[PDB]
Point group: D2
């Protein structure tokens, strides 16, 4: 259940992850298929840790949108023939005032398979 490689999800988005070093880490690019203003979508980075020990490991990473102010974070698990990432996310928008915070965070799921 190597997280390296090229994956796609059910909302059409695609990602690529670099090599995983043995202390958990990976780097990747994210191309989102869907967005708040898909007038402005580009390639966004992505930093994350993944257990290297259990064969169906938990994990988590961070996407940093280069086209807006928000952050999306993902956790989930890889299962086995074929590998499937079951994930969930929080998409945090930026609000101008802290008193506005309550409406900043959304949540959702996604399912990834290799390409």
């Amino acid at each position: 259940c190597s997280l390296t490689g090229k994956w796609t999800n059910d909302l059409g988005s695609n990602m690529t992850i670099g090599a995983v070093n043995s202390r958990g880490e990976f780097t990747g690019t994210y191309i989102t298929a869907v967005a708040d203003n898909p007038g402005n979508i580009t390639l966004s980075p992505l930093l994350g840790i993944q257990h290297k020990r259990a064969s169906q490991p938990t994990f988590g990473f961070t996407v940093n949108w280069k086209f807006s102010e928000s952050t999306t974070v993902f956790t989930g698990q890889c299962f086995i023939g074929k590998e499937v990432l079951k994930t969930m996310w929080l998409l945090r928008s930026s609000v101008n005032d802290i008193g506005d915070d309550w409406k900043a965070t959304r949540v959702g799921y996604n399912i990834f398979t290799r390409l």
Copy 2:
């Protein structure tokens, strides 16, 4: 300057330490939780995320690899400054590991957290 470099704590009593936030926003760090499913097990734990640098009240996100367990937590939120001090409004997801894909529906867990400097 809302840089997450430094020491932060939160409402349940956890302390984290973030190092250098690099030019691309990235930062390693460590997190001592004051609370887990098996709190007897608690150890130190490594942490990796990215922040926005431009934004004056930056949005952020990081991943905690809990070594003392098979699971993971991701955190997102925003840094704010009206007392003049800096609060981190964040929400998180705990991912537990189930054995089979069938149990997937029961693995993800959610909550909030409020971090301030030490």
Copy 3:
């Protein structure tokens, strides 16, 4: 998009909702596929509201679980010309300590289809 009728979600679970009154309110039953103690699973009742005016109505409801201390609430929206409910959910558990609160809440989703 009436919630009256016999739906079924993606995990295998089953529900039946009755008549929705003029102010959006409805009741029905929920036989679940899954649970944290499957040998316990029984018929549990539900209660929500559904915007009556919308052609693709938003709605929310609460399952009160017969066989245990805990509660799941759902929201979502109903799309079309076949009908489909997109829902996310929060499962709330009894902790016995409020210092233990941060862990009594869990999240997921469900797609619902008529039967």
Copy 4:
């Protein structure tokens, strides 16, 4: 005691009134939110839920049908005994917005939480 019947404020300003909690556990009530997307429109909105009866600190859930928007919120949580003897509520919630196409589903569920107090 930890019954829902009563009036409750929350860490964010908003208030709520809950009616009689029947045998089947149900309850009815109203809710003025202190905050929303178009706060000019905020009115009293209805509420409907179910809470576990016998247990001393019950789980519960209820649906808030937003009278001014086309949106819905669900809250879940528990009634605890804060040591002072006073009942605080711990919840988390979803807020569902309406979207025009099923393809936009992914953007319509906000998550958050609150703390209610007796009023």
